[PDB]
Design a protein around this nucleic acid. Structure first.
Length: 71
RNA sequence: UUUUUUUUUUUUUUUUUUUUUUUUUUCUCCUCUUUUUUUUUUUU
């Protein structure tokens, strides 16, 4: 008896086009764990432009799952 | 030196009654365009 808040893991398909565009300018990423997701993200820092990080994490933020309550 | 007479303002009053807002039409009718539908997160 309580009420908790979950984020069940995502699946590859919202990542597919993401990976595509990562596979368009340089960056190699992989999808096996939120640890290595976040790591292989935060390193990629395109030198001659600022928008890249914002934009990439924002399409990443169009990918993922939901947060809903349960007893 | 000029007398006498020719009516006037309809009579009547001591009758019972058990309803009720309104009121009566007008037909079927092509909604145009990046999408699956996004979604955690924190500061109110």
């Amino acid at each position: 008896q309580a009420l908790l808040r979950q984020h069940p893991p995502p699946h590859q398909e919202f990542f597919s086009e993401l990976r595509e565009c990562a596979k368009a300018k340089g960056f190699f990423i992989d999808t096996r764990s939120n640890k290595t997701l976040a790591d292989s993200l935060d390193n990629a820092n395109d030198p001659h432009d600022p928008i890249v990080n914002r934009l990439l994490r924002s399409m990443a933020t169009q990918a993922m799952s939901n947060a809903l309550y349960f007893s």
